[PDB]
RNA sequence: GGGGAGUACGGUCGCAAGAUUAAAACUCAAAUGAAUUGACGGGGGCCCGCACAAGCGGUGGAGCAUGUGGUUUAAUUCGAUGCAACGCGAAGAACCUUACCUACUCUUGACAUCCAGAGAACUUUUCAGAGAUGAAUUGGUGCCUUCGGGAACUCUGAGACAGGUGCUGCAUGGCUGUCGUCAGCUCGUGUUGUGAAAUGUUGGGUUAAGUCCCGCAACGAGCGCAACCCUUAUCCUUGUUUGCCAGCGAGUAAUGUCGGGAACUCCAGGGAGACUGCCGGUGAUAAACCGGAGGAAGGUGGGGAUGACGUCAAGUCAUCAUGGCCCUUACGAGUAGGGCUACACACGUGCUACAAUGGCGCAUACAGAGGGCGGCCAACUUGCGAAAGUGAGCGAAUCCCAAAAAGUGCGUCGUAGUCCGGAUUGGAGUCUGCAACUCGACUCCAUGAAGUCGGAAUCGCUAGUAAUCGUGGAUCAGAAUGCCACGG
């Protein structure tokens, strides 16, 4: 990837630890059924302010090793491409090629 | 086209770099953390003759083995701290002696990049490895020098092989390196393989 | 299996895991005293 | 020397056609002989592949989905282009992603090292703004002690530097497609030839196979073939829970329910088995071939993995890496809204149809494989339903996803635009998410388009195959007619 699409995602992840408590929380009143319809409006107003990069939605998964945002497995964390080259040095224990 | 040599046999007659389990969640931490290991210690040990970090998970700790030419060179207590700091786990390092480093795949295409980043003839440095390891007592050899080769404007691949080297046969003990002679004329690939005898008896 | 394109050509990977019970680095034990 | 040219002019000869004698200017750096290796031939011989034939089901036609082109657009990012691009990179574009566009913003910078100085970090809470940011607002101000110190983080300043999914895949590495899992591709030594080279590797049989056997100026060897690996067929041995339930007794509305069992299914570790080994025939007593016995399995048992040397300056500088080039108050950086989803249309790949071997309602049966913690979600209640309450269990042979569907049984439709088909649209919702207008899926209600088996042409398939039927998975907040996989 180029550095700052790198960079963004970085600050993204710091702003979803950062707010996770205060995000969940809110949605937590924009929902409870027995909760005041006004009381509600005041929980969906403060979730329009806080950094819309606090959702944690807006994170691409993206590759550990590169920062490919295609083509990743979680599992691993690592794009295909990378997946791959670990497995076939012999630096992802236990996977090896399949046949059956 | 061909498959690498260390993937196939995996499991069949080559172990595996990193031995430890992990359940889904810290799979992929510990991969990164492997990862950052290996990237720091490459990058410190560049005139130790490194061949091979062998990354065990003990528990809540990390043990590496750096297999080296150079045991003396290895310091270590601030391997073991940098290690540590990493992993951020109490970390471990050990070191193995590659006893005969001109039959380590990983080193003699090591050897081959160095020699081509000082202007070394390729066919030289090539030729040179076959034969010393051909002495040392392999059954057999392939070097594969792939670029810019001499800095001529049209990329070749030239490669020598000397003895057997049966990648199709699966309990054959080859060992694989791919090395990059980084250079004026752009980056220079050595593949080489070395075999040293097929294992019966399975891995 | 390709940098780019080439989506017929592709690698299976897998990874077993073994799981042995016992009821008196690479081993992930589990006492569970009932 | 090759062209000019056996030509011009002159002479001679001829009825003529023309013959004969025979230049030059100019021009080219060759023209040429023989032989060698390839490639090619609408040359020959001999062989193989779902190559054709034989079949079976498709595409082409319809509506949708999806990709591409074209066109449009402010932008519809970039790449992939015969085979071997076109449900491809993308294993999942509302925002993010995002590379594009418009607008607002910043230039030692979003990101990095260095240096100096200041501030712990952080925490509220607030105004402005689309937001980025900027200015105000409180709490906290710890570590490590040389104690002007360690760190570390925050901020600002300095210039070195940073940054670039900018260009070059025709400078590269790495990776990949392709011939094709085709049976080839070569070397050493010896021999032959002035030599390029040849021989080996050809020839007689044979084989899936340069497989093997004989011949033979070749003798050996290497990479390929095969084997070694995974899986699947059958058996044994070890063990027995979270799986099992034969024989066991006791229950429940039923339950392997539960005592108990270790038998069996199964699970998983270790072994056994298939070798043309055996018999008969055939052939050169060769290789091998045809057939038979035993056997779960027969001649490579089935499937997978495994891709020789190379070919296509094949693909990829946008995964990454990298030579060079280029940009550095911008080709770097932040944000907001658009866009990639546009559509006169063309094509590629799909899905669903056109109906009775069917639809429809009801009754009832038999799977495999896989996934699951900010996850999978039982039960209950509510709702026509999506779901919502709400509440267990389960990091899993335990709990959950979870229902198999084709099938079978009995009705109904009565063969038509229908009790076929499902598009489209109106309306009412649920859910995910800060946010579903552009541009999500899902539900309900209604609406019920095309289509009545599809031209030329063309694709896949030789067996648990095709066809058909559901089922799971990755990616993933949400979004699968694609893809990977599983059984009937």
Known sequence: AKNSMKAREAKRAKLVAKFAEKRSALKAIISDVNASEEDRWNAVLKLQSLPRDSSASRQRNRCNQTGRPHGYLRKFGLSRIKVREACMKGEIPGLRKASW | QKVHPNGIRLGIVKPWNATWFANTKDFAD?????????????????????????????????????????????????????????????????????????????????????????????????????????????????????????????????????????????????????????????????????????????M | ISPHVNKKARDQYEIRTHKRLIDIAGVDVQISLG
């Open chain 2, 30 to 202: 510990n991969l990164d953390g492997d990862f950052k290991v290996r990237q720091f210690l490459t990058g410190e040990l560049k005139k130790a003759s490194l061949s091979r970090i062998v990354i065990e998970r003990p528990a809540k700790s990390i043990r590496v083995t750096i297999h080296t030419a150079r045991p003396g060179v290895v310091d270590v207590e601030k391997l073991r701290a940098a290690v540590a700091k990493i992993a951020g786990v109490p970390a471990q390092i050990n070191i193995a002696e590659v006893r005969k480093p001109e039959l380590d795949a990983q080193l003699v295409g090591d050897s081959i990049a160095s020699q081509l980043e000082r202007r070394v003839m390729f066919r030289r440095a090539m030729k040179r490895a076959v034969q010393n390891a051909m002495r040392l007592g392999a059954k057999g050899i392939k070097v594969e020098v792939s670029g810019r080769l001499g800095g001529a404007e049209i990329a070749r691949s030239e490669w020598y092989r000397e003895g057997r080297v049966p990648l199709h046969t699966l309990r054959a003990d080859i060992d694989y390196a791919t090395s990059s002679a980084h250079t004026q004329y752009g980056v220079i690939g050595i593949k080489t393989w070395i075999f040293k005898g097929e294992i019966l008896g399975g």
